[PDB]
Amino acid sequence: MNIFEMLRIDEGLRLEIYKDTEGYYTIGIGHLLTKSPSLNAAKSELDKAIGRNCNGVITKDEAEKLFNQDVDAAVRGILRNAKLKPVYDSLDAVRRCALINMVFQMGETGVAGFTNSLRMLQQKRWDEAAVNLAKSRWYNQTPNRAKRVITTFRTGTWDAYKNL
């Protein structure tokens, strides 16, 4: 299991514009297009992102290309962030995938806000961090995905995904 397979399980693959859990316009493998209510704004962002007139639909290849960019941007983002970098540096390989997953879903800014949880992971207090991470809007809104990530931080194994 690796970061790509993990995120592909959590996000799914859709080749037509769709609305995410929060109601925003998304395409491919969790690629957020716009928070704007306009399907037109969305379609415009889409063509800009692909470099073609897509008319709301993309190919598998296009979805994967966007996915490759997003994952890369997530990693570079963590590495450039004063709050996340040190946490990332401190973790083992599997747990690193867990942090990457959070950043891909909620952005650098959002994860950087989990101050106390970040501190606990850094200290390797696994159980305590899992309990703190569950006290969030994130967990309440997307509990099955949050649980998978949380289990990953808890155990340092891919058990939560070996099912899926």
Swiss-Prot record:
GO terms for cellular component: host cell cytoplasm. It is an enzyme of class 3 (hydrolase). GO terms for molecular function: lysozyme activity. Its main location: host cell. It comes from the Viruses. The keyword Ribosomal protein does not apply. Induction: Expressed late in the viral replication. Its EC number is 3.2.1.17. Pfam families: Phage_lysozyme. Changing E11Q: Complete loss of activity. PANTHER family: T4-TYPE LYSOZYME 1-RELATED. This is Endolysin. The gene is E.
